[PDB]
Amino acid sequence: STGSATTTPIDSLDDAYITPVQIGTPAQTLNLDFDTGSSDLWVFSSETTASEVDGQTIYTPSKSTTAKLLSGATWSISYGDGSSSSGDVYTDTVSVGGLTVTGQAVESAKKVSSSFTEDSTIDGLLGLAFSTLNTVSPTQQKTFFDNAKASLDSPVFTADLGYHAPGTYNFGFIDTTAYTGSITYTAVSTKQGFWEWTSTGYAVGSGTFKSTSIDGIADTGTTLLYLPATVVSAYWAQVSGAKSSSSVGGYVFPCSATLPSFTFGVGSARIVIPGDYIDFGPISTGSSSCFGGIQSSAGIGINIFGDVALKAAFVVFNGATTPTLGFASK
Numbered sequence: 128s129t130g131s132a133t134t135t136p137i138d139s140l141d142d143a144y145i146t147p148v149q150i151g152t153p154a155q156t157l158n159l160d161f162d163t164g165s166s167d168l169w170v171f172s173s174e175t176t177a178s179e180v181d182g183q184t185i186y187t188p189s190k191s192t193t194a195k196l197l198s199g200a201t202w203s204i205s206y207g208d209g210s211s212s213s214g215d216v217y218t219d220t221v222s223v224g225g226l227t228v229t230g231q232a233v234e235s236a237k238k239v240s241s242s243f244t245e246d247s248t249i250d251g252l253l254g255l256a257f258s259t260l261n262t263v264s265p266t267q268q269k270t271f272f273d274n275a276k277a278s279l280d281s282p283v284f285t286a287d288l289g290y291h292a293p294g295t296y297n298f299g300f301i302d303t304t305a306y307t308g309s310i311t312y313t314a315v316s317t318k319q320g321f322w323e324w325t326s327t328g329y330a331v332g333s334g335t336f337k338s339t340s341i342d343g344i345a346d347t348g349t350t351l352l353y354l355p356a357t358v359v360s361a362y363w364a365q366v367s368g369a370k371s372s373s374s375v376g377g378y379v380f381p382c383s384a385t386l387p388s389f390t391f392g393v394g395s396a397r398i399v400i401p402g403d404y405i406d407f408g409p410i411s412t413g414s415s416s417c418f419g420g421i422q423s424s425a426g427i428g429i430n431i432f433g434d435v436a437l438k439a440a441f442v443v444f445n446g447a448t449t450p451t452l453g454f455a456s457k
Contacts, residue, residue, distance in 0.1 A: 128227075128280065128299055129297065130225045131224040132223050133293050133294070134288065134293065136291065137246070138248070141288075141438065142350050143160050143249060143348075143350060144294070145158035145248060145249060145250075146158065146223070146253070148222070148223055149223075150170065150220070151192075151194055151220060152191055152193040153190075155186050155191065157184050158248065158250045160348060161253045161296055162252050162254050162255060162346070162348030163344075163347045164346035165206065165252065165254040165348060167202060167262055168221070168231065168232065168234060169202065169212055169214070169233075169234035169235070169236055170234070170251035171185045171186070171236055171239070171243075171251055172186045172187065172188070172214070172235040173186070173187040173189065174215065174235050174237050175235075175239060176238055179238065180244065182247030183247055186235065186250075193219050193229075195217060195219070197215075197216040197217060197266075197268075199265065200232075200266060200268075201213070201215055201216070201263070202262045202264070203262055210239075210240045210241075210242040212239040213237060213238050214236040215235055216263055216268070217235055218230045221271060223296070223298065224297075226279075226299065230274070231271055232269070234268075254271075255347070256320055256322065257273075257321070258270050258273045260321075272446060275298060275299075278299075279300075281300060281301070283299065283445050283447075284446070285301060285302070285305075285444065286441075286442045287442070288438035289438060290438050290439075301443060306441035306455035307457055310454065311394045311395070312394075312452065312453045313393050313452050313453075314451060319344075321429075322345040323342065323344050326342075326343065327393065327395070328341070329390060329391050331389060332365055332387030332389075333387075336390065336397070341354065341391075343424075343430030343431055346431050346437075347433075347434060350434050351407070351420050351421065351433050352389070352400070352431070353423065353429075353433065354423070356424075359421055359423045362421050363378050363419065366384050366386060371423075372416075377418065377419060378423075379410060379416045379418055381416070382408075385402060386403065387402050389405065391436060398439050404435055405420035405421055406419075407419065420435040439456075441454070441456075442454055
């Protein structure tokens with residue numbers, strides 16, 4: 128089997144991407160944030176505290192003839208941005224782009240934090256990291272990909288995120304028309320439950336490539352590119368007027384600037400992030416200070432190849448017995 132679904136930016140900045148997902152019988156279509164940095168499939172639901180729902184589409188398990196309460200199971204998750212959600216669990220039929228999993232754990236939110244309530248465009252998350260990170264207790268549950276893998280033509284999914292444009296998540300096949308050149312594959316460590324890999328270095332603009340190992344995670348659920356302070360300082364030093372602002376929470380730059388590109392290494396290959404992808408717009412409406420798309424990881428504990436980096440590439444998440452990641456230009 129295979130599946131193919133279009134993913135669409137939620138706003139003009141590409142802050143996140145939503146992908147339609149069919150849950151239950153008859154289908155209830157929710158727009159979920161596919162997140163390769165987490166491993167829970169959770170949704171706004173008929174059980175979510177009413178004051179915490181503000182425009183999202185909800186899953187109502189009582190209207191699904193295939194929903195079954197997973198007795199005793201609860202979940203609770205906290206994300207790197209400080210947001211969180213929790214609730215109980217059903218199993219139900221879940222389909223993505225024509226690919227169907229029966230018995231998928233669908234985690235029904237009883238509570239969500241303010242940032243989820245405030246984002247009416249995201250109806251939940253679909254985790255695509257390794258199932259060892261799944262938060263369901265007392266019986267940990269498998270991700271959609273883990274459940275689908277055996278049925279897939281090939282045990283892979285791919286992320287092809289657009290810049291200010293829709294893109295595609297494919298399951299079970301590699302669309303050889305979706306990228307240029309060849310795909311360069313690189314080793315993955317699953318020891319932290321992430322798609323964790325080591326970039327071979329970076330360049331700023333037309334500058335020379337610096338060979339240096341940068342361990343980080345391929346995370347479709349994170350907007351920006353978080354890298355070591357040395358690397359980020361070298362980037363922003365090439366932008367007149369750019370500075371790190373403690374009050375804003377990161378590097379800002381004059382909105383009048385033209386940003387340089389940023390290149391990261393994948394083995395001997397190179398992925399170029401155009402400068403425009405690094406512009407996240409005014410810090411507040413009407414400001415001439417703009418927020419940078421490359422930020423320090425120093426306070427995170429891990430480097431994060433988020434959407435800013437991933438949308439510059441066609442990315443293969445290879446879930447073979449020994450997982451690997453593949454990157455191609457496009």
